[PDB]
Structure formats: C-alpha cells, structure tokens
Amino acid sequence: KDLRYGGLVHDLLADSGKATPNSDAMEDAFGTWTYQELLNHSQAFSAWLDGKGVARGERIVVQLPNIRQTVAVFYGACRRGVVFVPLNPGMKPFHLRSVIADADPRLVIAEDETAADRLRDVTDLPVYSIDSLWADVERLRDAGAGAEAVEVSPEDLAVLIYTSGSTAAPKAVACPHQQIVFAASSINAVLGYHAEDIVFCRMSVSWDFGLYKVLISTLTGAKLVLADIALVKSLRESGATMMPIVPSLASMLTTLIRRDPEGAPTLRMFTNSAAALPQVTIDALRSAFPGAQVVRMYGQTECKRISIMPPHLEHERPDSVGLPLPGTTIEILTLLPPGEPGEITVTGPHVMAGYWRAPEITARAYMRLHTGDYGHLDEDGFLYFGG
C-alpha cells in the first residue's frame, strides 16, 4: 500500500532531503537541522568512514546521547552499508566490554573525552570522541564530501539492537535494511505521521522505540525533537504533536500536567508500547489532553512491532493490544481457532534476521517468530494476552 518492500534506510533520508530540503528534520538541546543539513552531515560522516577505511558489513559501536550528530552517524553508516550499533550512555563498564566484544566492531564512538577513556579501558579498538571527530566531519561537509552512493543491498544489515541486560549474555537483534524500512512504513500506515507533525521523543535511539521515531519522522518529512519537571513546558514550547510513551513516562506526564493549566494543546497522539498501559493512565491522558488519541501497541525488537490498535478504535476492546501490522500475520499456536489461547507467533517482512552470531538462541525464537508470549485472537483478528 504505503508499505515499502525492498527498501534501503538511507533512501528515506535522500528522498526527504530532496523533497523538503528546507523543512526542519531534527532538533536537540543545541540546535536544529533541516533535512538538507541532515543529508549534508550524514554524507560528510559517510566520507569520514571512507577516510577510516570502514568497509561495507563492518560494525561501528556508537555510545551517544540523543543529539543530532548521532542521527547523522546512523544515516552516514547506512549510506556505506556499515552496521550501526547504538548503545546507551551510562552502561556499566563490564557490560560494555561484553557487548562491544560481541558486536566486534571496527571502531567505537564515544560521547566525550572522559567517556572515550572509560571505553578505552574495556576495548583495544580505536575509540573516537564525537566532538573531535566532528571537527573533521564539518571540514568534509564543507568540502562537499561523501555525496556519492555505494552499493548497499536491501538484505544487508543496517543495525544491531542490543536487548540484553547487565546480568545477561550479550544479545542483539540483527536488522537488515528492508525489514527496517518495511516496519517503519507499516507502523506509519496505521499511525499517520505526516510532514507537519512534531515528534517529541524521549527514548534513546539505542532502543528501537527511539530509532523508529528517527525513521518514521524521516519517512514522512516530520520534525523530530530529541529530548524533566519541565516536560509539560518542553512539549508545549516545541509544539509537539506526536509523543511515544511508555507507561511510566505517561504517569509522570499526567502528574506533571495537573501543575500546569496551559497544558500542551498541540498534542494529538500518544503511542504506547513496551508495557501494558493501565486504564487510569489512559483516562488521565485523555482528561489532560482531550484532543489526543491514546494508542495501544505491542512489540518485540525481534520484529520491531507486532500489533497496533488503530487510533480511531482507541476506546474499544480495552484488553486488546490491537491488530497485526499491515502486511504481517499473527498466528496462535498447530494453528488454533479464534478465542483459543496459545503462543503468539508472527510472520512477515518485519521479522528481523535473527540474533547476531547466536545460531542457538536464534533457532528457538525464529521466517516465523515465536514471541514466547501467550494469548489469543478474537473473532475479528484482534490480539489479547492470556484468555
């Protein structure tokens, strides 16, 4: 439909960079880039990788906060078939050691010089601070470098997304270009982001929750705001229209909102995943933001996302986490009839390429994804947990 099959991630950026070069693409605490600017910096970063001889298929590990440079790193890497491995700032050292070694990168990008030193303790790979490598990126940007394309297959890996905690063995979902682009397009076919949306994103891009607000905004030409007591004020002052949430962020927001009768009227949608959103939170979100839809979703990183409750149905089937993503199938398993509980299983062009270098773990979970969650489909195709 609007579903994209066989896509490359960086093509999302090239399109918007040509289609709306002068619209705002990314804002952070420090400034704003238009789509032209994001394209230029992404190209410049691609030349920096070329300059360092990082080849197609190799990984870079990037431990950065939510700032404009990280998005340019993501796209520039994509443009060279290099594998973006985003990690959250503040991981414990031993945890980093384990994950960096598993990811097996060509090099590592850190937040600043103190962080670059801590990283040097835990790997022998080359480690670059973002502020120092960025002086070069800007030179390259000024020289117009990296503008050329290179061969990248839709089947090539774009990203490894680590989901394992400290106390666990390292584990990353291995994400090819095509699946990513497909999943973004399918989510958006349900959610309806568009070019005048302003997305207020408080999730790290190291989580697929934030990564996909980068992708979905880029896909549609929207503006992404990379964002504590001031949350209400931030939302209102950014003119935010779309906001991904998790239940703890939504409770916080409803507490904060009662202290501020100016609200954040520009808000039109909250999209919840990751955990079950209680009714009381939903009610309080609608009360503070009567203009906004509160949309329930459910997913796993293994296939990005599984179900979305269509916005227009937000008041119905209160126990459901919605319908399958458009272009995908949910089956309950030996296929069971409707209403019969069983394991939630998922088939489609969003199902990712397994876990990175872990045939054994991959075998149990994976062309069909077994979520290890249990529930049923009602008569109409809607998904529920339990019975």
Ligand X SMILES: C[C@H](C(=O)O)[C@H](N)C(=O)O
Positions that interact with ligand X (CB under 6 A): 208-209, 273-274, 297, 299-301, 304-305
Is 24 or 208 the residue whose CB approaches ligand X more closely?
A: 208
b/e string for 357-380 if b means 16 or more Cβ within 10 A?
ebeeebeebbeebebeeebbbeee
CB of 262 to ligand X, least distance (A): 30
Longest Cα–Cα distance of the chain, Å, equals 62
β-strand partners of 61: 85, 108
Can you say whether residue 279 is alpha, beta or left, with left for phi > 0 and alpha for psi between -120 and 50 degrees? alpha
Nearer to ligand X, 133 or 361 (CB): 361
Take residue 343 and report the two structure tokens written for it.
Answer: 């394991």
Q: Which is nearer to ligand X, 11 or 208 (CB)?
A: 208
Minimal distance in Å, beta carbon 113 to ligand X? Answer: 32
Q: Which two tokens stand for residue 246?
A: 């998790």
Report the nearest approach of ligand X to the CB of residue 321 (Å): 9
d(CA 4, CA 372): 28
Measured from the CB atom, the residue of 7 and 299 that comes closer to ligand X is 299
Give the nearest distance from C-beta 312 to ligand X in angstroms.
Answer: 19
CB of 366: closest distance to ligand X in angstroms?
16
Q: Residue 262 burial by CB count (10 A; 0-12/13-18/19+): exposed, middle or buried?
A: exposed
- Least distance to ligand X from the beta carbon of 81, Å? 24
Closest CB 211 distance from ligand X, rounded Å: 9
**Which residue lies nearer to ligand X by CB, 237 or 319?**
319
**Between 202 and 305, CB nearer to ligand X:** 305
Nearer to ligand X, 274 or 295 (CB): 274
Residue with Cβ nearer ligand X (179 or 301): 301
Indicate the residue among 125 and 252 with the shorter CB distance to ligand X: 252
| Residue from 249, 246, 285, 292 nearest 269 by CA | 292
The CB-of-364 to ligand X minimum distance in angstroms stands at 18
Residue 244 phi, psi (nearest 5) = -75, 145
Q: How far is the CB of 249 from ligand X (least distance, A)?
A: 12
Closer CB to ligand X, 227 or 297, in the complex: 297
- Residue at shortest CB range from ligand X: 299
> Smallest distance from the beta carbon of 246 to ligand X, in angstroms?
8
